Tab-separated table of all heavy atoms in Angstrom:
chain	number	residue	atom	x	y	z
Q	5	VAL	N	127.991	141.174	70.261
Q	5	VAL	CA	128.668	142.471	70.255
Q	5	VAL	C	129.610	142.648	69.044
Q	5	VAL	O	130.073	143.756	68.762
Q	5	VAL	CB	129.402	142.702	71.645
Q	5	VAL	CG1	130.668	141.822	71.731
Q	5	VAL	CG2	129.653	144.209	71.883
Q	6	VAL	N	129.899	141.574	68.314
Q	6	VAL	CA	130.814	141.671	67.173
Q	6	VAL	C	130.229	142.640	66.117
Q	6	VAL	O	129.021	142.557	65.800
Q	6	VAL	CB	131.134	140.271	66.549
Q	6	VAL	CG1	131.862	140.418	65.120
Q	6	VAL	CG2	131.976	139.483	67.536
Q	7	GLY	N	131.049	143.575	65.622
Q	7	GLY	CA	130.548	144.604	64.673
Q	7	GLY	C	129.869	145.793	65.350
Q	7	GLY	O	129.448	146.734	64.666
Q	8	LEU	N	129.799	145.776	66.691
Q	8	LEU	CA	129.149	146.852	67.479
Q	8	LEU	C	130.159	147.501	68.433
Q	8	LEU	O	131.160	146.865	68.784
Q	8	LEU	CB	127.951	146.295	68.282
Q	8	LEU	CG	126.824	145.727	67.425
Q	8	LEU	CD1	125.815	144.981	68.310
Q	8	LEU	CD2	126.126	146.840	66.564
Q	9	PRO	N	129.913	148.766	68.844
Q	9	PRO	CA	130.909	149.483	69.669
Q	9	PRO	C	130.754	149.302	71.190
Q	9	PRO	O	131.407	150.030	71.963
Q	9	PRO	CB	130.631	150.949	69.323
Q	9	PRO	CG	129.070	150.964	69.076
Q	9	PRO	CD	128.727	149.609	68.510
Q	10	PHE	N	129.939	148.342	71.626
Q	10	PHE	CA	129.634	148.182	73.072
Q	10	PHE	C	130.628	147.309	73.844
Q	10	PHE	O	131.428	146.592	73.245
Q	10	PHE	CB	128.215	147.611	73.278
Q	10	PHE	CG	127.155	148.341	72.494
Q	10	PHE	CD1	126.555	147.742	71.383
Q	10	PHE	CD2	126.758	149.639	72.868
Q	10	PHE	CE1	125.552	148.419	70.648
Q	10	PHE	CE2	125.776	150.326	72.160
Q	10	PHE	CZ	125.175	149.724	71.031
Q	11	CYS	N	130.566	147.432	75.164
Q	11	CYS	CA	131.026	146.398	76.079
Q	11	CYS	C	129.783	145.865	76.799
Q	11	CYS	O	129.055	146.640	77.427
Q	11	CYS	CB	131.982	146.958	77.131
Q	11	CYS	SG	132.601	145.620	78.209
Q	12	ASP	N	129.549	144.554	76.694
Q	12	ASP	CA	128.376	143.888	77.288
Q	12	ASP	C	128.801	143.196	78.576
Q	12	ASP	O	129.765	142.445	78.554
Q	12	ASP	CB	127.835	142.810	76.330
Q	12	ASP	CG	127.081	143.383	75.119
Q	12	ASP	OD1	127.000	144.626	75.021
Q	12	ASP	OD2	126.543	142.569	74.284
Q	13	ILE	N	128.095	143.433	79.688
Q	13	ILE	CA	128.493	142.882	80.995
Q	13	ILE	C	127.323	142.200	81.711
Q	13	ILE	O	126.279	142.801	81.909
Q	13	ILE	CB	129.133	143.988	81.912
Q	13	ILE	CG1	130.324	144.673	81.206
Q	13	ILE	CG2	129.527	143.429	83.298
Q	13	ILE	CD1	130.876	145.940	81.961
Q	14	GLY	N	127.509	140.931	82.077
Q	14	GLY	CA	126.589	140.195	82.951
Q	14	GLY	C	127.382	139.580	84.100
Q	14	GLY	O	128.618	139.635	84.110
Q	15	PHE	N	126.695	139.001	85.093
Q	15	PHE	CA	127.404	138.424	86.234
Q	15	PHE	C	126.508	137.455	86.984
Q	15	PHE	O	125.310	137.389	86.710
Q	15	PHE	CB	127.970	139.528	87.169
Q	15	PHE	CG	126.937	140.150	88.067
Q	15	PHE	CD1	126.737	139.661	89.353
Q	15	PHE	CD2	126.155	141.201	87.623
Q	15	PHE	CE1	125.777	140.203	90.201
Q	15	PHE	CE2	125.184	141.759	88.457
Q	15	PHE	CZ	124.993	141.259	89.739
Q	16	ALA	N	127.104	136.668	87.879
Q	16	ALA	CA	126.396	135.703	88.706
Q	16	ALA	C	127.145	135.612	90.028
Q	16	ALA	O	128.361	135.836	90.088
Q	16	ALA	CB	126.329	134.341	88.032
Q	17	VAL	N	126.402	135.319	91.086
Q	17	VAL	CA	126.957	135.253	92.431
Q	17	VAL	C	126.528	133.933	93.077
Q	17	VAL	O	125.404	133.491	92.890
Q	17	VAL	CB	126.463	136.434	93.290
Q	17	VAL	CG1	126.649	136.148	94.809
Q	17	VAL	CG2	127.162	137.701	92.868
Q	18	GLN	N	127.427	133.293	93.804
Q	18	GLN	CA	127.014	132.184	94.639
Q	18	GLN	C	127.795	132.270	95.923
Q	18	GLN	O	129.019	132.155	95.916
Q	18	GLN	CB	127.222	130.837	93.948
Q	18	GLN	CG	126.722	129.642	94.797
Q	18	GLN	CD	127.114	128.325	94.167
Q	18	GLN	OE1	128.303	127.952	94.119
Q	18	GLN	NE2	126.120	127.621	93.643
Q	19	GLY	N	127.089	132.503	97.027
Q	19	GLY	CA	127.756	132.765	98.300
Q	19	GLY	C	128.783	133.873	98.132
Q	19	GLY	O	128.464	134.945	97.633
Q	20	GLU	N	130.028	133.604	98.516
Q	20	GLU	CA	131.094	134.624	98.438
Q	20	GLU	C	131.855	134.653	97.104
Q	20	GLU	O	132.859	135.352	97.001
Q	20	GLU	CB	132.099	134.467	99.599
Q	20	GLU	CG	133.076	133.285	99.398
Q	20	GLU	CD	133.873	132.878	100.659
Q	20	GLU	OE1	134.005	133.698	101.644
Q	20	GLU	OE2	134.374	131.710	100.628
Q	21	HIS	N	131.378	133.914	96.097
Q	21	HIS	CA	132.001	133.898	94.781
Q	21	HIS	C	131.211	134.671	93.740
Q	21	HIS	O	129.982	134.585	93.652
Q	21	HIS	CB	132.255	132.456	94.319
Q	21	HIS	CG	133.190	131.707	95.227
Q	21	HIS	ND1	132.751	130.791	96.163
Q	21	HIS	CD2	134.535	131.796	95.388
Q	21	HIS	CE1	133.789	130.326	96.835
Q	21	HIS	NE2	134.882	130.917	96.379
Q	22	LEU	N	131.949	135.432	92.951
Q	22	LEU	CA	131.405	136.241	91.890
Q	22	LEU	C	132.099	135.864	90.569
Q	22	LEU	O	133.332	135.725	90.541
Q	22	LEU	CB	131.644	137.722	92.192
Q	22	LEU	CG	131.425	138.689	91.023
Q	22	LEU	CD1	129.940	138.900	90.740
Q	22	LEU	CD2	132.110	140.035	91.278
Q	23	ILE	N	131.296	135.695	89.504
Q	23	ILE	CA	131.786	135.605	88.144
Q	23	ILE	C	131.182	136.755	87.316
Q	23	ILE	O	129.964	136.888	87.229
Q	23	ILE	CB	131.462	134.220	87.526
Q	23	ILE	CG1	132.169	133.096	88.331
Q	23	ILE	CG2	131.828	134.143	86.018
Q	23	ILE	CD1	131.618	131.692	88.034
Q	24	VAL	N	132.037	137.597	86.745
Q	24	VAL	CA	131.629	138.634	85.796
Q	24	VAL	C	132.046	138.201	84.396
Q	24	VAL	O	133.168	137.715	84.198
Q	24	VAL	CB	132.277	140.025	86.120
Q	24	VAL	CG1	131.838	141.123	85.084
Q	24	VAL	CG2	131.969	140.434	87.543
Q	25	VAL	N	131.130	138.336	83.433
Q	25	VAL	CA	131.433	138.029	82.035
Q	25	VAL	C	131.275	139.311	81.199
Q	25	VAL	O	130.192	139.925	81.182
Q	25	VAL	CB	130.526	136.894	81.494
Q	25	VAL	CG1	130.794	136.607	79.997
Q	25	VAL	CG2	130.696	135.623	82.360
Q	26	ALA	N	132.354	139.708	80.525
Q	26	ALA	CA	132.352	140.923	79.680
Q	26	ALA	C	132.777	140.611	78.241
Q	26	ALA	O	133.691	139.830	78.020
Q	26	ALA	CB	133.248	142.007	80.292
Q	27	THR	N	132.092	141.186	77.264
Q	27	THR	CA	132.456	141.001	75.849
Q	27	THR	C	132.616	142.365	75.182
Q	27	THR	O	132.052	143.354	75.633
Q	27	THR	CB	131.386	140.234	75.051
Q	27	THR	OG1	130.147	140.920	75.217
Q	27	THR	CG2	131.211	138.804	75.536
Q	28	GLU	N	133.390	142.412	74.102
Q	28	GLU	CA	133.472	143.625	73.318
Q	28	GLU	C	133.952	143.131	71.977
Q	28	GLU	O	134.421	141.994	71.853
Q	28	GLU	CB	134.498	144.594	73.925
Q	28	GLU	CG	135.933	143.980	73.879
Q	28	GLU	CD	136.985	144.779	74.609
Q	28	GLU	OE1	136.636	145.581	75.507
Q	28	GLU	OE2	138.188	144.586	74.291
Q	29	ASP	N	133.830	143.972	70.963
Q	29	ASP	CA	134.527	143.720	69.727
Q	29	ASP	C	135.948	144.266	69.912
Q	29	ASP	O	136.121	145.448	70.197
Q	29	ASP	CB	133.812	144.380	68.536
Q	29	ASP	CG	134.461	144.029	67.220
Q	29	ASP	OD1	135.717	143.923	67.180
Q	29	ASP	OD2	133.725	143.816	66.234
Q	30	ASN	N	136.958	143.406	69.776
Q	30	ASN	CA	138.330	143.822	70.048
Q	30	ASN	C	138.821	145.014	69.219
Q	30	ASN	O	139.661	145.765	69.687
Q	30	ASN	CB	139.303	142.647	69.925
Q	30	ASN	CG	139.375	142.117	68.524
Q	30	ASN	OD1	138.399	141.597	68.015
Q	30	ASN	ND2	140.510	142.281	67.876
Q	31	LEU	N	138.320	145.175	67.996
Q	31	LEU	CA	138.713	146.291	67.116
Q	31	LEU	C	137.880	147.561	67.345
Q	31	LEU	O	138.234	148.647	66.840
Q	31	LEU	CB	138.604	145.887	65.619
Q	31	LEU	CG	139.504	144.725	65.128
Q	31	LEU	CD1	139.249	144.513	63.641
Q	31	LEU	CD2	140.999	144.942	65.427
């Protein structure tokens, strides 16, 4: 995503636990 205007979002679930991973170019 570096140099691009997006926010990229993926995730994973195991039982009652969720992890979301999000990236963006900070500028």
